[PDB]
């Protein structure tokens, strides 16, 4: 199957694959807030173009697109866009999340007139919409190609409001599941401070876990990750139902994703607070949602002062970046993803194949130290070769632009340059 030994050598040779897609840089335009999803030989992609500042510039265009991932005969995956939609008020669309089912990608987004709902939570009126796009659109054949739906029925249980929160979800049967987050008033949050793991942490106080379940210690809301379920069999009015994540290894609600690998679902949750080691695992149950988190000791993420990479003591912290990983071998629990090789700055993307306690092999994605942020990795088989596609949000030196780049990385089946007659003997 795959190379399962640690290898210091050069068995990973990533390739750039965005040149076939309409991601076209222009001086003075920043390309931000990207999403990538890959399922069943199709993909979904989104970004926001801003004129000027990536955070304060003029929203120019929100791209929401779908397409095909093809083997054109050269035994590599190539990406071609088939269907693009742009909303007329791009500044109001936030936190899109894409899930594939049969003919379509369904993309669930938040609609907001007060900016990012995470930063303006009390002032955001809950408003969700869905854009449905055919992956292979057809002439005449109305309503099929593109369909916009405002969601009117949301079942949110005890949460004051809910929102998609992560790049991509899964289908099971005819039910869609999007990574999501629920906003619960801090006063209603039940948490026992004695369970906060401070045992061998000299400067951590028992209140630290509960305080860092919102974006600051005095936030009106705490954030809880979960799923938004959309059963397509029901028909008629769309009903989204929120499913909260169980409280084993609970961290602040954060961008997440759920995906199928080798026939079962898997979950990644970004580490946006004091528990900085990577959070991913097989999903035990989807509803209620419970994840069997790996005890991973080698993959972390960069932070800032209080919660830097490899920090494990509870602190009051809202820091980190989304850098997911994709399970490629369940028997040996081996995963592939891009991590940022830096302690307190978002820098230096490295593609790595790793187990719980050891990185097997890895390659830097840039030739010198480079600012990079969110990374999203999805893997699949081409015939019987494991390929991964990784989106990397990056500062691009060539044209002096912030933009997503897409790499394709073939996972080696053989560990070694040669067979090695010493170890095997005659």
């Amino acid at each position, epitope marked *: 199957q795959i190379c399962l030994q640690k290898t210091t050598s050069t068995i990973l040779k990533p390739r750039l694959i965005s040149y076939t897609l309409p991601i*076209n840089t222009r001086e003075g335009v920043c390309i931000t807030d990207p999403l990538l999803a890959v399922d069943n030989g199709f993909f979904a992609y989104s970004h926001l173009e801003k004129i000027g500042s990536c955070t304060r510039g003029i929203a120019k265009q929100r791209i929401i697109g779908v397409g095909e991932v*093809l083997d054109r005969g050269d035994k*590599v995956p190539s990406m071609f866009m088939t269907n693009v939609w742009t909303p007329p008020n791009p500044s109001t669309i936030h936190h899109c999340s894409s899930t594939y089912h049969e003919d379509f990608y369904y993309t669930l987004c938040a609609v907001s007139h007060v900016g990012d709902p995470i930063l303006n939570s009390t002032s955001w009126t809950e408003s969700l919409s869905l854009i449905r796009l055919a992956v292979r659109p057809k002439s005449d054949s109305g309503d099929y190609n593109q369909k916009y739906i405002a969601i009117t029925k949301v079942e949110r249980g005890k949460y004051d409001k809910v929102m998609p929160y992560g790049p991509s979800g899964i289908k099971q049967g005819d039910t869609l599941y999007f990574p999501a987050v629920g906003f619960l008033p801090r006063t209603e949050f039940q948490y026992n401070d004695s369970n906060c793991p401070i045992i061998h942490c000299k400067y951590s106080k028992a209140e630290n876990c509960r305080l860092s379940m919102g974006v600051n210690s005095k936030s009106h809301y705490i954030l809880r990750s979960g799923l938004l379920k959309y059963n397509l069999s029901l028909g008629g009015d769309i009903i989204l139902q929120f499913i909260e994540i169980a409280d084993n290894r609970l961290t602040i609600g954060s961008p997440s994703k759920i995906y199928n690998s080798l026939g079962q679902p898997v979950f990644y949750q970004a580490s946006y607070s004091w528990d900085t080691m990577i959070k991913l695992g097989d999903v035990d149950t989807v509803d209620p949602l419970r994840v069997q988190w790996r005890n991973n000791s080698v993959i972390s993420r960069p932070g800032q002062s209080q919660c830097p990479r490899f920090n494990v003591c509870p602190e009051v912290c809202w820091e980190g970046t989304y850098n997911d990983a994709f399970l490629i071998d369940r028997l040996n629990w081996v995963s592939a993803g891009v991590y940022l090789n830096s302690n307190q700055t978002a820098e230096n993307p490295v593609f790595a194949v790793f187990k719980d306690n050891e990185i097997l092999y890895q390659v830097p994605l840039a030739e010198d130290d480079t600012n990079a942020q969110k990374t999203i990795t999805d893997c699949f088989l081409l015939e019987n070769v494991i390929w991964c596609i990784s989106l990397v949000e990056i500062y691009d030196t060539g044209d002096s632009v912030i933009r997503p780049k897409l790499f394709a990385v073939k996972i080696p089946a053989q560990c070694s340059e040669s067979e090695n007659l010493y170890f095997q003997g005659h």
Partner: antibody
Framework: QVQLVQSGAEVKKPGSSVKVSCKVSGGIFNRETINWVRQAPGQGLEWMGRITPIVDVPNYPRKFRGRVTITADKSTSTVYMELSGLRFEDTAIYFC???????????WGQGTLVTVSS | SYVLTQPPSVSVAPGQTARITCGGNNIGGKSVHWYQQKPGQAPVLVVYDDRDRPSGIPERFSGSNSGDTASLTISRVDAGDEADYFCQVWDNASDEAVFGGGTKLTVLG
């Protein structure tokens, strides 16, 4: 199989421009990525740019931006390369070639000679 | 930016083995591809992905890449092997193809 047939030789004065064609047959025109590469005498090969007609937005190295214009015509399944402000040092054979594997070229066109002289 | 260095010329007699080199800083980390070009002709791909052979290319053409040196080795060289051999990589930093200077192979037939 894809094959690439280029236009014939051209003789040009310095300061003029020239438009070279690359007819693509076989394959699927919109999804082929056609690159241009020139070979000057006594010098290696030099990459000049590319286009994928489904995107229809060419890109070039900074050297050739502003002097090289690449376009695609799906009605004739032809890719064009126009080099303006010709100089003596633009005398070379220009090849088109199809990108494979996101990394190499196969096949190549037969090449077009461009001689620039006063 | 990135530079590939090739020896300008090599001479081998028929039946012998010709070994063409292509040097680059940590070229072993990139995929190296090889083309054969005869005078007045278009280049022809003879090796891709360091060591793989396209259809129609004989088993005598072999490729290796490691460290700072990639190699194209032609076994039992015929007269019809006379050509200029170019190595090539794709530089992910600049997002451009880079070619070696080419190595002129002469068969003393």
């Amino acid at each position: 199989q894809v094959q690439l047939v280029q236009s014939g030789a051209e003789v040009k004065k310095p300061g003029s421009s020239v438009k070279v064609s690359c007819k693509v047959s076989g394959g699927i025109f919109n999804r082929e990525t056609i690159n241009w590469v020139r070979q000057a005498p006594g010098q290696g090969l030099e990459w000049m740019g590319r286009i994928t007609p489904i995107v229809d937005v060419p890109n070039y190295p900074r050297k050739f931006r502003g002097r090289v214009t690449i376009t695609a015509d799906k009605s004739t399944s032809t890719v064009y390369m126009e080099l303006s402000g010709l100089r003596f040092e633009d005398t070379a054979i220009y090849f088109c070639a199809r990108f494979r594997g996101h990394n190499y070229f196969d096949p190549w066109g037969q090449g077009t000679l461009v001689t620039v002289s006063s | 930016s990135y530079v590939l260095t090739q020896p300008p010329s090599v001479s081998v007699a028929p039946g012998q083995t010709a070994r063409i080199t292509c040097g680059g800083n940590n070229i072993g980390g990139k995929s190296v591809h090889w083309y054969q070009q005869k005078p007045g002709q278009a280049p022809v791909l003879v090796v891709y992905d360091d060591r793989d052979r396209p259809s129609g290319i004989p088993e005598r053409f072999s490729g290796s890449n490691s460290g700072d040196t990639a190699s194209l080795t032609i076994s039992r060289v015929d007269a019809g092997d006379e050509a200029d051999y170019f190595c090539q990589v794709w530089d992910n930093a600049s997002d451009e193809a880079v070619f070696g200077g080419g190595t002129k192979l002469t068969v003393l037939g």
